């Protein structure tokens, strides 16, 4: 009957483009009916077809993005669109390792004289 998204994800790339082509052609006819005094029932189909076109485009874009992220997985440099967004300030932060870097003497103090666990007898 209507478009089911989980069924679209099982289709191949060519099938989605073919279905997208049909949906756009169908929507064009509905637009003609809207200006030629089409029946009210046919004017309600515009909303359904518009939803279908968006769903097909969403599946196509999601698959394309997912494949690209797998291609650049484990690569040093990624396209800016695929890099994490977060915030500007968060991206400029020192890494976790860099923030914890200390001098050799500071490292030795942590080992030689760390805070000890102790208690006072009552």
């Amino acid at each position: 009957a209507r478009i089911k998204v989980h069924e679209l994800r099982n289709k191949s790339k060519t099938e989605l483009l073919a279905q997208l082509k049909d949906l756009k052609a169908e929507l064009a006819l509905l637009r003609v009916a809207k200006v030629t005094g089409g029946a009210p029932n046919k004017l309600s189909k515009i909303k359904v077809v518009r939803l279908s076109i968006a769903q097909v485009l969403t599946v196509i874009s999601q698959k394309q993005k997912a494949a690209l992220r797998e291609v650049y997985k484990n690569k040093k440099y990624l396209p800016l669109d695929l890099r994490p967004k977060k915030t500007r300030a968060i991206r400029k932060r020192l890494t976790k390792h860099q923030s914890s870097l200390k001098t050799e003497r500071e490292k030795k103090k942590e080992m030689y004289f760390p805070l000890r666990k102790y208690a006072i007898k009552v």
Binding site: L94, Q98, L101, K102, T103
Partner: protein
């Protein structure tokens, strides 16, 4: 250990050797623009005691600043006010020439962090400083525990908030006790605290 010889030689600025070297350098600087990148510090001994290290990420710029006081920037020297405020000349900027040199380099080099600076030469018209800047984005800096503190956001434009060595001087922070107490934590913070009218609940 050669730096002590260089440092002691630079303490004798009126000797013939230094007067000749400074005279030639002063001419050379006048011919170049007011802010110039230098391949290496002119005073390596002085630079490294202010934090400079000979590694990628550290850069040195020479800044030229004009000498003298601060003429009040008012049209035709006309002041609309009482005589106490009618002075135009013999007015002095509250910040020092060293601070100005840091600010000039900092504003121009927005992608770098100002670390420190030092005097290198002067004539009657101009004063010359070298400003040490750090590329906080360079990996060599970010992996160095002694300098990577400057990569944190709280240290943005230290020179424009008076947080450099020259900044602490003109804010009155070089010193403590009865002669400098009004400068901490800041002069305006002290004023606001002392002006506060504390109206407690039970008074």
């Amino acid at each position: 250990g050669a730096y002590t010889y260089v440092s002691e030689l630079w303490r004798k600025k009126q000797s013939d050797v230094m007067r000749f070297l400074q005279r030639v350098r002063c001419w050379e600087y006048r011919q170049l623009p007011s802010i110039v990148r230098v391949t290496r510090p002119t005073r390596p001994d002085k630079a490294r005691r202010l934090g400079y290290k000979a590694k990628q990420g550290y850069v040195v710029y020479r800044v030229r600043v004009k000498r003298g006081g601060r003429k009040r920037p008012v049209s035709k020297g006309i002041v609309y006010g009482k005589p106490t405020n009618q002075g135009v000349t013999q007015l002095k900027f509250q910040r020092s020439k060293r601070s100005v040199a840091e600010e000039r380099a900092g504003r121009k080099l927005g992608g770098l962090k100002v670390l420190n600076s030092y005097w290198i030469n002067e004539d009657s018209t101009y004063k010359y400083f070298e400003v040490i800047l750090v590329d906080q984005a360079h990996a060599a800096i970010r992996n160095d525990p002694r300098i990577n503190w400057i990569c944190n956001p709280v240290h943005k434009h230290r020179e424009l908030r008076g947080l450099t060595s020259a900044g602490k001087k003109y804010r009155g922070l070089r010193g403590r006790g009865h002669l400098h107490h009004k400068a901490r934590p800041s002069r305006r913070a002290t004023w606001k605290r002392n002006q506060t009218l504390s109206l407690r609940r039970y008074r």
